[PDB]
Design an enzyme around this catalytic site. Sequence first.
Site, PDB file in Angstrom:
ATOM      1  N   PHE A   1      -1.936 -15.461  -0.288  1.00  0.00           N
ATOM      2  CA  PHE A   1      -1.251 -14.602  -1.241  1.00  0.00           C
ATOM      3  C   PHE A   1       0.257 -14.613  -0.951  1.00  0.00           C
ATOM      4  O   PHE A   1       1.102 -14.660  -1.882  1.00  0.00           O
ATOM      5  CB  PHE A   1      -1.861 -13.156  -1.294  1.00  0.00           C
ATOM      6  CG  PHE A   1      -2.966 -12.989  -2.323  1.00  0.00           C
ATOM      7  CD1 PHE A   1      -3.900 -14.034  -2.582  1.00  0.00           C
ATOM      8  CD2 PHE A   1      -3.096 -11.770  -3.057  1.00  0.00           C
ATOM      9  CE1 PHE A   1      -4.943 -13.907  -3.563  1.00  0.00           C
ATOM     10  CE2 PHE A   1      -4.113 -11.607  -4.044  1.00  0.00           C
ATOM     11  CZ  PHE A   1      -5.052 -12.686  -4.301  1.00  0.00           C
TER      12      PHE A   1
ATOM     13  N   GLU B   1       0.776  -1.223   0.000  1.00  0.00           N
ATOM     14  CA  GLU B   1       0.000   0.000   0.000  1.00  0.00           C
ATOM     15  C   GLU B   1       0.817   1.287   0.000  1.00  0.00           C
ATOM     16  O   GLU B   1       0.274   2.295  -0.418  1.00  0.00           O
ATOM     17  CB  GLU B   1      -0.958   0.006   1.210  1.00  0.00           C
ATOM     18  CG  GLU B   1      -2.127  -1.040   1.089  1.00  0.00           C
ATOM     19  CD  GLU B   1      -1.622  -2.476   0.973  1.00  0.00           C
ATOM     20  OE1 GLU B   1      -0.773  -2.928   1.769  1.00  0.00           O
ATOM     21  OE2 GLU B   1      -2.087  -3.214   0.074  1.00  0.00           O
TER      22      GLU B   1
ATOM     23  N   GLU C   1       4.531 -14.591  -2.764  1.00  0.00           N
ATOM     24  CA  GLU C   1       5.483 -13.741  -2.080  1.00  0.00           C
ATOM     25  C   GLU C   1       6.703 -14.517  -1.662  1.00  0.00           C
ATOM     26  O   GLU C   1       7.790 -14.265  -2.152  1.00  0.00           O
ATOM     27  CB  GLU C   1       4.829 -12.962  -0.927  1.00  0.00           C
ATOM     28  CG  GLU C   1       3.781 -12.031  -1.513  1.00  0.00           C
ATOM     29  CD  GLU C   1       2.930 -11.246  -0.526  1.00  0.00           C
ATOM     30  OE1 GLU C   1       2.884 -11.500   0.697  1.00  0.00           O
ATOM     31  OE2 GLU C   1       2.241 -10.338  -1.005  1.00  0.00           O
TER      32      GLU C   1
HETATM   33  C1  AVU Z   1       0.974  -9.449  -0.669  1.00  0.00           C
HETATM   34  O1  AVU Z   1       0.150 -10.505  -0.204  1.00  0.00           O
HETATM   35  C2  AVU Z   1      -0.115 -10.439   1.225  1.00  0.00           C
HETATM   36  C3  AVU Z   1      -1.623 -10.360   1.541  1.00  0.00           C
HETATM   37  O2  AVU Z   1      -2.500 -11.460   1.207  1.00  0.00           O
HETATM   38  P1  AVU Z   1      -2.634 -12.903   2.089  1.00  0.00           P
HETATM   39  O3  AVU Z   1      -3.660 -13.834   1.430  1.00  0.00           O
HETATM   40  O4  AVU Z   1      -1.260 -13.498   2.419  1.00  0.00           O
HETATM   41  O5  AVU Z   1      -3.373 -12.243   3.396  1.00  0.00           O
HETATM   42  P2  AVU Z   1      -4.957 -12.119   3.641  1.00  0.00           P
HETATM   43  O6  AVU Z   1      -5.208 -11.189   4.798  1.00  0.00           O
HETATM   44  O7  AVU Z   1      -5.440 -13.514   3.781  1.00  0.00           O
HETATM   45  O8  AVU Z   1      -5.581 -11.492   2.286  1.00  0.00           O
HETATM   46  C4  AVU Z   1      -6.383 -10.303   2.280  1.00  0.00           C
HETATM   47  C5  AVU Z   1      -6.857  -9.982   0.850  1.00  0.00           C
HETATM   48  O9  AVU Z   1      -6.764  -8.566   0.564  1.00  0.00           O
HETATM   49  C6  AVU Z   1      -6.108  -8.372  -0.715  1.00  0.00           C
HETATM   50  N1  AVU Z   1      -5.167  -7.204  -0.760  1.00  0.00           N
HETATM   51  C7  AVU Z   1      -3.824  -7.159  -0.583  1.00  0.00           C
HETATM   52  N2  AVU Z   1      -3.403  -5.874  -0.722  1.00  0.00           N
HETATM   53  C8  AVU Z   1      -4.491  -5.113  -1.000  1.00  0.00           C
HETATM   54  C9  AVU Z   1      -4.724  -3.756  -1.249  1.00  0.00           C
HETATM   55  N3  AVU Z   1      -3.740  -2.820  -1.259  1.00  0.00           N
HETATM   56  N4  AVU Z   1      -5.990  -3.344  -1.495  1.00  0.00           N
HETATM   57  C10 AVU Z   1      -7.017  -4.209  -1.501  1.00  0.00           C
HETATM   58  N5  AVU Z   1      -6.828  -5.510  -1.272  1.00  0.00           N
HETATM   59  C11 AVU Z   1      -5.583  -5.972  -1.023  1.00  0.00           C
HETATM   60  C12 AVU Z   1      -5.394  -9.666  -1.105  1.00  0.00           C
HETATM   61  O10 AVU Z   1      -5.544  -9.894  -2.515  1.00  0.00           O
HETATM   62  C13 AVU Z   1      -6.055 -10.731  -0.240  1.00  0.00           C
HETATM   63  O11 AVU Z   1      -6.894 -11.585  -1.039  1.00  0.00           O
HETATM   64  C14 AVU Z   1       0.699  -9.230   1.711  1.00  0.00           C
HETATM   65  O12 AVU Z   1       1.846  -9.612   2.479  1.00  0.00           O
HETATM   66  C15 AVU Z   1       1.233  -8.522   0.472  1.00  0.00           C
HETATM   67  F1  AVU Z   1       0.447  -7.425   0.222  1.00  0.00           F
END
Ligand code: AVU
Lengths: 251, 252
Positions: A174, A98, A179
């Site tokens: 994710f 972000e 990652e």
């Molecule tokens: C890249 O990936 C992770 C975050 O995703 P994880 O699945 O590991 O975590 P979770 O809490 O289960 O997923 C939450 C969802 O929100 C979405 N998301 C990520 N970043 C954003 C932003 N900036 N805006 C809206 N949605 C977002 C993801 O796609 C998940 O599905 C982090 O460590 C890194 F960001």
Amino acid sequence: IVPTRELENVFLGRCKDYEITRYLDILPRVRSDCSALWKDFFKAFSFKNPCDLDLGSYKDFFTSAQQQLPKNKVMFWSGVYDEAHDYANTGRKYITLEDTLPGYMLNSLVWCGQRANPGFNEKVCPDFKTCPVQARESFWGMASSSYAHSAEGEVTYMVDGSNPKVPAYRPDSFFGKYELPNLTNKVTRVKVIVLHRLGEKIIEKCGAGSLLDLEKLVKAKHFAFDCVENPRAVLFLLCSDNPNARECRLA
Amino acid sequence: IVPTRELENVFLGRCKDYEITRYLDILPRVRSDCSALWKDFFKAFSFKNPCDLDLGSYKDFFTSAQQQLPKNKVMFWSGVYDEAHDYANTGRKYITLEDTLPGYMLNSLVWCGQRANPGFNEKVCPDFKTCPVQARESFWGMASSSYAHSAEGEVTYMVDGSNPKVPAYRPDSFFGKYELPNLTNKVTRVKVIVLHRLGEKIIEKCGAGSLLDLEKLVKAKHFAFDCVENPRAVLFLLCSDNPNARECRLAK
Ligand SMILES: *[C@H]1O[C@H](COP(=O)(O)OP(=O)(O)OC[C@H]2O[C@@H](n3cnc4c(N)ncnc43)[C@H](O)[C@@H]2O)[C@@H](O)[C@@H]1F
Ligand SMILES: *[C@H]1O[C@H](COP(=O)(O)OP(=O)(O)OC[C@H]2O[C@@H](n3cnc4c(N)ncnc43)[C@H](O)[C@@H]2O)[C@@H](O)[C@@H]1F
């Protein structure tokens, strides 16, 4: 589900705001101007059915918009969005997706293709569940990979250790998909921070369950690994929002 | 001193992003569009010497850009910017000026008029510590007054209690000059939070010194009044930055 109004204007204003005034001492400017970035972005989805995308769709956008990331400062997280972002503190302690240029510009936005002019829908977008996973995950999938691939030095990873349904670490998250596997030999160490939500059953610990799997995963990447449960600086953030919790007791 | 580059495009990009995406469930949109708001903002300092500005230069901007403010939510601060902003938490717990449209649009930005075309200086702006009071505080002056005027219900005032050189309350602070006096009877109470920075001398305390001065003024305007020093939710916040401070010791 309704697409964001004036996607381009929103995109271009965020871009321009960022370029000129956001994260000046914390993250580098990118080479491309805001028009070039819009064009790389818009072509990934425009004039196609909303499910017609795959993991390469946004690649050019990501190559352009990808910043170098400060060594040791990159934070990842799963299931603890608000807590990671609050501890990261808008880039003063850690960098999150972000705070970067593309994560900043596209945060919370909703968009999709249609075939008919003006090239995008201004009414409705499909539920993500209807599209194949490669289309569904085309944007944040690529953004996750690009960001991870750019990490140097120590990386920090915050997780939920009090979700009885969802393990702290999962390959299908994710983090698990985009990652960790994309972390390069510039990364030296994966520091896990486990969040034990105040007043809830502790479900996972350092050295057990899915955290043990992570540990092994990480050593096999040849990184170093440490893990800590509610370190004090995080504990204190949890306690401002719940000062009566047994965990936040003085004397 | 160095003015913000591309002031117009920054203003405009800021204003459109705020408009379509910021504080949506927290703060109302304004009637007036971004284009119009540039105009009122520009006309205010444009084609005038820099120090040629007064309390009323930006009054049209602020009329157009003032939102109504959720009751019990507004927070003012003096001398403790970061803490207050941290504690308010981007509009989730309290609202600050910088959560509002004008606050959000101009935060950090630097700008000034000139007489000759194009009416603003993209290259240099005077040490505003050298302009007359009314002129240096022409912009945030009006912002603070207008913000205060829009406040409803209980307002919070967070203050520095560990500053030997600067009273927690003064009549010449932005609070004392522009906010407190512009508090309308929409306001019912002033809740003072006193910040005793970790590991500094306590200088001010509830019910003595400037605080008693504050308390007297507040009651005269017929608001209710209260005051605490380092309430726990604030303490915990300070302790996250300094976990090993004496005053963040926890139970066995
Ligand atoms: C890249 O990936 C992770 C975050 O995703 P994880 O699945 O590991 O975590 P979770 O809490 O289960 O997923 C939450 C969802 O929100 C979405 N998301 C990520 N970043 C954003 C932003 N900036 N805006 C809206 N949605 C977002 C993801 O796609 C998940 O599905 C982090 O460590 C890194 F960001
Ligand atoms: C309205 O103002 C107060 C904050 O101002 P105070 O003077 O009471 O507090 P202090 O920390 O001593 O001084 C702040 C000074 O900076 C100017 N200022 C206020 N807000 C801004 C922003 N957003 N950008 C630039 N400068 C700003 C004032 O001129 C002060 O001189 C808050 O309670 C309300 F927001």
